[PDB]
Design an enzyme around this catalytic site. Structure first.
Site, PDB file in Angstrom:
ATOM      1  N   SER A 188      25.822  -7.570  44.846  1.00  0.00           N
ATOM      2  CA  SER A 188      26.089  -8.556  43.824  1.00  0.00           C
ATOM      3  C   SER A 188      25.392  -8.168  42.531  1.00  0.00           C
ATOM      4  CB  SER A 188      25.627  -9.930  44.311  1.00  0.00           C
ATOM      5  OG  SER A 188      25.685 -10.915  43.297  1.00  0.00           O
ATOM      6  N   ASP A 219      33.504 -13.337  63.210  1.00  0.00           N
ATOM      7  CA  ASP A 219      32.187 -12.969  62.709  1.00  0.00           C
ATOM      8  C   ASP A 219      32.235 -11.598  62.043  1.00  0.00           C
ATOM      9  OD1 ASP A 219      29.529 -12.575  62.221  1.00  0.00           O
ATOM     10  OD2 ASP A 219      28.947 -12.306  64.329  1.00  0.00           O
TER      11      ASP A 219
END
EC number: 3.4.23.22
Length: 330
Positions: A199, A35
């Site tokens: 992004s 994770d």
């Protein structure tokens, strides 16, 4: 040193991925959920409340000659999906894919929430976010990666998750045969303890690319892609019959649909998520309403590039002094 381990979807939907991890001496192999959005290595154990164990493999520290109680240390964690676990702490030898760390904090669960009990395939979590998020008290502990880093050939790990197929976690090297083209690296902020990046935009299907900054985290422990409501609405508007359902808890779409791809930007590069990756199947057995793999982050407080996004790429988690993230197509 290096390590290399195969990671395998837990079910036919790729809800999560499990990777075998050797703990203790002799080795006890547990299948952990790696994770990159948390920083605790915790396991089902011989200390876990018996009624809360249902099929998981447990770690038994009393059977490990290298286990030592970390005296006074406790831990307690709550995840974004509302699940939780807590317990005490041992140090022991932990190996992943041939890479060994001695003195790793292994957090033994005394209690786990129902979602963990109900998932027989996940024996615990191995956190790969920054150690500043580790919950052990009163002495915070380091992640497996942080402990291994100095010994690694290069201070990196890579995630190469499969779509409905196994994939690979590598430590200490970049497998140049595992991706196509070049890797595009992008800046990371560690301010919140995550692999947080920005992004450069998105496209829906064959549509034009929208240049827009989307701050979010690369999180292997989250199944879906969670993005701003504007972006998500633009995606689902291209699917006839798709709608957001408050009763179901997100966007659903007719199972008869063909889903468009979704592209996200990494600098000037582009990662394309095929439409099929966005299908999470019937909302309930036999239903013709299917659950979407792109959902709104509104009210999560952060955008999350979960498995839906990451499995479309070869992803480099560069833990150099100034960390960065790399993405390549594959």
């Amino acid at each position: 040193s290096t390590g290399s381990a195969t990671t395998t979807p837990i079910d036919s939907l790729d809800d999560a991925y499990i990777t075998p991890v050797q703990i203790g001496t002799p080795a006890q192999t547990l299948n952990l959920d790696f994770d990159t959005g948390s920083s605790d290595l915790w396991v089902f154990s011989s200390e876990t409340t018996a009624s809360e164990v249902d099929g998981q493999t447990i770690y038994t520290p009393s059977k490990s000659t290298t286990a030592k109680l970390l005296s006074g240390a406790t831990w307690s964690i709550s995840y974004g999906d509302g699940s939780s676990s807590s317990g005490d702490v041992y140090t022991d030898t932990v190996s992943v894919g041939g890479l060994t760390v001695t003195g790793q904090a292994v957090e033994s669960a005394k209690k786990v929430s129902s979602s963990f009990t109900e998932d027989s395939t996940i024996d615990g979590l191995l956190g790969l976010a920054f150690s500043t998020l580790n919950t052990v008290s009163p002495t915070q502990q380091k992640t497996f990666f942080d402990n291994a880093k100095a010994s690694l050939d290069s201070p990196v790990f890579t995630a190469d998750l499969g779509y409905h197929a196994p994939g690979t976690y590598n430590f200490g090297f970049i497998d140049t045969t595992a991706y196509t083209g070049s890797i595009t690296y992008t800046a990371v902020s560690t301010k919140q303890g995550f692999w947080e990046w920005t992004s450069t935009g998105y496209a829906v299907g064959s549509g034009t690319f929208k240049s827009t900054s989307i701050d979010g985290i690369a999180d292997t422990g989250t199944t879906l892609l969670y993005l701003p409501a504007t972006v998500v609405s633009a995606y689902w508007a291209q699917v006839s019959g798709a709608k957001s359902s408050s009763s179901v808890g997100g966007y659903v779409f007719p199972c008869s649909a063909t889903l468009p791809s979704f592209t996200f930007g990494v600098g000037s590069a582009r990662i394309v998520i095929p439409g099929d990756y966005i299908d999470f199947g019937p909302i309930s057995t036999g239903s013709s309403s299917c659950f979407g793999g792109i959902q709104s982050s509104a009210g999560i407080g952060i955008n999350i590039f979960g498995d839906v996004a990451l499995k479309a790429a070869f992803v480099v988690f560069n833990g150099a002094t100034t960390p960065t993230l790399g993405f390549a197509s594959k």
